[PDB]
Ligand binder design. Structure first.
Ligand SMILES: [Ca+2]
Ligand SMILES: [Ca+2]
Ligand SMILES: [Mn+2]
Ligand SMILES: [Mn+2]
Lengths: 47, 181, 181, 47
């Protein structure tokens, strides 16, 4: 198994609106590659 | 109290609870954001708006997402530009492509963006990427220039499992990426 | 596999994951479908399309919904028309008002309606309602004329708790309504 | 506690489309009442 972990403090209330959409993006340029997602799970709790 | 939760382990040709943009589409059980073609963008958003903080309480949400993705490039030295998980306003549209990854427009702090992204960035852009030139995980806040980066070795064609978690009490965003070998 | 969960224990005056039709709005922590005004309709849909069966596999979803409601009428003998929980095609908008509860247009079986509703019917429509004239819980499939009804004693201004459960194994739909006293 | 329960077989596959919206409806006529919902929750599992 190989893993990588990164953390950062982000003050979300100061950066994003109260309501949001979540999503994936990918791009290619001159060099390129296929970018695919096989599964996606999500949970949040406000209050 | 609001909560929201969802799980997709196989994508339908007609995934009606996603919004596709650019080359985004579903084929074979999977969500394809780009194929291996030059100068293209794909995004896919979950269709429901999430309540992430409340102006009234000043509460902020805890959340966790996890997903599996694959990057499939023609070789180890022909790969660009990379892949994000992002959080953005409800009406978000694709932004500049290429090394701005469909999500941002400049390396300068742009408080109108109101976008947080976690990038898996496969291409050194000399103007903003870490100078060691390696591939890397970054936390991006209103800018393509990450606030924090971790060097990462792309395993081409392999499935990575990502979890991203946000602790509201702490305002810490954690990202872990795992490969099987 | 594909799952979806959500809980709102308390409604924002700006609830961007709900679609409001007619009078429906949020005030004061609650979802108001009608004021105590006459000849009116309100509806509120959850914004996200739900994947209820899969043509691919002919799998069908198990689901459960829980909700708390109050009907507040001027008097035990001045109350009309009632309230439903329904399931309908993604593009649904209000149908006929009054005894048809905003969801149906006919007492005859209409398979173009593609709507199942659970009704809490507070007013006797002689054209289709059970003859006993009692208020009642009904299961409605493509018609305002229920396929099964249970007599129900309205407790005016009291919160009712409802659970509605559908067992895909069995195609049994179960409704429970409880009052505290 | 006053409770009421009702059961019926509904063949969902033959009545509604694969994708649906869920929601609430209420109407008034010449007689009338306020109709209102205090909390709501939902789980669904396909496959
Ligand atoms: Ca880059
Ligand atoms: Ca009636
Ligand atoms: Mn970068
Ligand atoms: Mn009836």
């Amino acid at each position: 198994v190989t893993s990588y972990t990164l953390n950062e403090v982000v003050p979300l209330k100061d950066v994003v609106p109260e309501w949001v959409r979540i999503g994936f993006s990918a791009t290619t340029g001159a060099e390129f590659a296929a970018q695919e997602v096989h599964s996606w799970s999500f949970n949040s709790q406000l209050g | 109290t609001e909560t929201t939760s969802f799980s997709i382990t196989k994508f339908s040709p007609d995934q009606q609870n996603l919004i596709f943009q650019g080359d985004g589409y579903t084929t074979k059980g999977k969500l394809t954001l780009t194929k291996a073609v030059k100068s293209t963008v794909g995004r896919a958003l979950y269709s429901t708006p999430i309540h992430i903080w409340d102006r009234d309480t000043g509460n902020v949400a805890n959340f966790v997402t996890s997903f599996t993705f694959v990057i499939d490039a023609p070789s180890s030295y022909n790969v660009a530009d990379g892949f994000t998980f992002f959080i953005a306003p409800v009406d978000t549209k694709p932004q500049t492509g290429g090394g701005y990854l469909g999500v941002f427009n400049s390396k300068e702090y742009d408080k109108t963006s109101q976008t947080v992204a976690v990038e898996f960035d496969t291409f050194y852009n000399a103007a903003w990427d870490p100078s060691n030139k390696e591939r890397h995980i970054g936390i991006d806040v209103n800018s393509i220039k990450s606030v924090n980066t971790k060097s990462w070795n792309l395993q081409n064609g392999e499935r990575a499992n990502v979890v991203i978690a946000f602790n509201a009490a702490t305002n810490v965003l954690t990202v872990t990426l795992t490969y099987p070998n």
